[PDB]
Write a protein that binds this ligand. Structure first.
Ligand SMILES: COc1c(N2C[C@@H]3CCCN[C@@H]3C2)c(F)cc2c(=O)c(C(=O)O)cn(C3CC3)c12
Ligand SMILES: [Mg+2]
Ligand SMILES: [Mg+2]
Lengths: 190, 98, 135, 49, 61, 92, 49, 61, 67
DNA sequence: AATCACCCGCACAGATTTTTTAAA
DNA sequence: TTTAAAAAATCTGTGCGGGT
DNA sequence: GATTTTATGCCTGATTCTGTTT
DNA sequence: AAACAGAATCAGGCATAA
């Protein structure tokens, strides 16, 4: 059967849904740990896989497959592009991923495909997820209700100030520059 | 400052250091690259000026014993193309300006 | 990229606008090829509220959509009596990225072809979300 | 001429110019000087601020 | 993620499908809404979002 | 530092290496089970993952990632093309 | 005209011809009849045979 | 899979690289070998592969 | 390469580099590509090979570490 | 395995349109 | 009394990073 | 997320040369 | 003195790779 609908209500409902979803869950960072949802999911998946800083490397395809098959219901090329940026010394003041292979250069060259490279966690990335197994944060559900994901990380590093952020949303945006770790620690102590 | 009088009573302004700099043995550069003159329009008199002050006049002396006096403030601002400053007749040229 | 039908009377035909290539192929495989046509969309479409007229004319997605509709555009040759189908149906995913595309298409139709909306030729589809089974 | 000792870009100026003037023009017209607009917005209790 | 047969029998079969028909009610507020939500100016859009989605939800009295 | 070499020996050794590798490990089936190495590796990976016939489905990217990252040292698009053909009713 | 019941392709015969000649020409010229070359080669004890 | 600095320092540095130089020895056997291995006919190639890869390997003393 | 081709305009004295180095992977596909390149060079430009302008690189395969 | 076109906000250099002002 | 030149005031591309 | 060019062997349909005949 | 049979050549398609 066919039921009528007014165009104003449809427009308003659809646009409000899209705007609220983008504002709250895709493009802005949390003030407590300084991460977007995709960064948090990537780090949690790497931690669950057992990919530590003093063990052997793993291929990027395996990590991308786990991330998009258990936590993140989107495409894989953008996830790989997100992972690549967290390992470049000319992008992050303190890198969070350790890479092995061709990851680009400041000259503007692109990185190799994910069938060629390998990654593992950096040493400072273990301080963002300290005491994760002692019930210090809340857990939420994934898109199926089969897995659980942390709601925020129990970080010891003021990540937002020391690494910055930049994102574009509907109606607003953000732009934060990076800082130096020792100075921020001294300010916190003061 | 440099004031250039052409063969048709046109006036242009320019700085000294804007001119080409070369050595003793060099030939020079064509001034057509610096001023929008005609094909046969050539300078005939140059009046250096330090700065503009008061309402003093400029005495212009041409060939064939012609004289003219004009207020200096009219030349305080000039465009790319000069303004006529004297109505010359036939082959009469400015030879002395102070 | 259009997959047409066999019926020649425009009052007995339908046109589907699908969100992606995979859904476009799925719709092509399982349709009634007697009186149903499929036209796939790739990527997000232009916002014709923020753009200029020549920019809208030089975009290939909008150009193909205008050609498939068959009415013409420009307020100089726009004749709403030559519409090739009398039912236009919008089919997108049931997530937040389908609402955006629905809004963009509604904006295009309302700003450029008011008579089509006035006469009631535009529809919206309702796919299900769950499936349960016990034995 | 960049190498393992670091970045190195070489620009040569004619005899009829001054290095400072061309350097200033390069500052003005290319990306040898950029602006950075600071705008600090983040999520606090689930709300932008 | 659906098989073509499921898609046909759930959405495209005229015997068992459901749809919506789009109509225009006022035609004088529709222009305002379209201009506000899809226009170039950002401030009206931000104010609209902040007024509707943020504050009105916290107090649904 | 620099060592001379004859062209005939280099050509012969390289071509024999490639030919034997392709004959014994890429394109011919085994008479006992009728599988090529890639089919066997895909099936073994799916068995290790616990992807049984009376449980829920799994994303294809996860299986392809496991196969590429643990057993098959090649590209990932041809592996997906191989997996697709094993599920078509008009091919098998 | 294929549908859910099964495959169905319709070819229309002209008024001045018999169907059999057209069908045989279609058999001879199109892919309504193909050849399959059988060649049974497999690996036995690590050798082709 | 190698970092660019490793690749340079192990393969491209003139003070550490090792390479081979190609020469021609007979020039009458090379033509026949190239024709056999890279030509159009398949039977000589199959015979050569069999002789050099089965009998000369599985049988020796 | 900048020498021309066709044995009607082919002049081996216009070579733009006097060292040509082939670098591939250490597997079987690298061997196949090496054979194809050698076939091209020997069939189409014999004088380049006869003058010793062609080389082959040799990268390592393993890296070991303890402390 | 590289290449191609849109959404979303903000800042700025460069190209077009109006408006004024000194010369014939 | 025209009438070409400044000169201001508006427009128009473009790129940053997660998504289709 | 589509389209774009090679290797490797076997079989077929369409096109182009070559000696023969009316 | 062109037709006309017979032979030789050339593309394309099929499943794993770069
Ligand atoms: C075919 O759509 C895409 C285009 N195009 C769309 C344009 C209009 C139609 C004709 N093709 C052009 C190129 C593109 F340029 C890039 C991407 C892309 O990067 C991407 C991804 O997952 O990374 C996914 N998609 C599809 C999911 C949208 C892309
Ligand atoms: Mg992309
Ligand atoms: Mg491929």
């Amino acid at each position: 059967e066919i039921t009528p609908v007014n165009i104003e209500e449809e427009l308003k409902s659809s646009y409000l849904d899209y705007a609220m979803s983008v504002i709250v869950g895709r493009a802005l960072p949390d003030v407590r740990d300084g991460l977007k949802p995709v960064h948090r999911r990537v780090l949690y998946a790497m931690n669950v896989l057992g990919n530590d800083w003093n063990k052997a490397y793993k291929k990027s395809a395996r990590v991308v497959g786990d991330v998009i098959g258990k936590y993140h219901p989107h495409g894989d090329s953008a996830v790989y592009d997100t992972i690549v940026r967290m390992a470049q010394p000319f992008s992050l003041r303190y890198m969070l991923v350790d890479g092995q292979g061709n990851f680009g250069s400041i000259d503007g060259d692109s990185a190799a495909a994910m069938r060629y490279t390998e990654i593992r966690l950096a040493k400072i990335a273990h301080e963002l997820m300290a005491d994760l197994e002692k019930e210090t944060v809340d857990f939420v559900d994934n898109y199926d209700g089969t897995e659980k994901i942390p709601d925020v990380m129990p970080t010891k590093i003021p990540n937002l100030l020391v690494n910055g952020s930049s994102g574009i949303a509907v109606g607003m945006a953000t732009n934060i520059p990076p800082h130096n770790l020792t100075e921020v620690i001294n300010g916190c102590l003061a | 400052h440099i004031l250039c009088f052409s063969s048709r009573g046109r006036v242009y302004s320019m700085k000294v250091y804007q001119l080409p700099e070369a050595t003793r043995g060099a030939r020079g550069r064509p001034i057509v690259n610096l001023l929008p003159l005609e094909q046969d329009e050539r300078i005939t008199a140059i009046l250096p000026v330090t700065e503009f002050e008061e309402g003093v006049k400029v005495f212009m002396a041409t060939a064939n014993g012609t004289v003219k006096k004009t207020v200096l403030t009219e030349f305080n601002r000039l465009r790319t193309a000069g303004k006529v400053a004297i109505k010359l007749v036939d082959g009469d040229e400015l030879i002395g300006v102070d | 990229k259009l997959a047409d039908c066999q019926e020649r009377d425009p009052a007995l035909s339908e046109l589907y606008l699908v969100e992606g290539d995979s859904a476009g192929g799925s719709a092509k495989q399982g349709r009634n090829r007697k009186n149903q046509a499929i036209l796939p969309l790739k990527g997000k479409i232009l916002n014709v509220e923020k753009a200029r007229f020549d920019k809208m004319l030089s975009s290939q997605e909008v150009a193909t959509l205008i050609t498939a509709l068959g009415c013409g555009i420009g307020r100089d040759e726009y004749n709403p009596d030559k519409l090739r189908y009398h039912s236009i149906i919008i089919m997108t995913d049931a997530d937040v990225d389908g609402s955006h595309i629905r809004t963009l298409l509604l904006t295009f139709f309302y700003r450029q072809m008011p008579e089509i909306v006035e006469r009631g030729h535009v529809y919206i589809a309702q796919p299900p979300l769950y499936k349960v089974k016990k034995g | 001429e960049s190498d393992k000792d670091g970045m190195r870009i070489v620009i040569e100026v004619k005899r009829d110019a001054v290095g400072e003037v061309v350097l200033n023009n390069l500052y003005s017209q290319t990306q040898l000087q950029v602006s950075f607009g600071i705008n600090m917005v983040a999520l606090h209790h689930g709300q932008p601020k | 993620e659906m098989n073509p047969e499921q898609l046909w029998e759930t959405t495209m079969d005229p015997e068992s499908r459901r749809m919506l028909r789009v109509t225009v009610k006022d035609a004088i507020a529709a222009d305002q809404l379209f201009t506000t939500l899809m226009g170039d100016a950002v401030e009206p859009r931000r104010a609209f979002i902040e007024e509707n989605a943020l504050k009105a939800a916290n107090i649904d009295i």
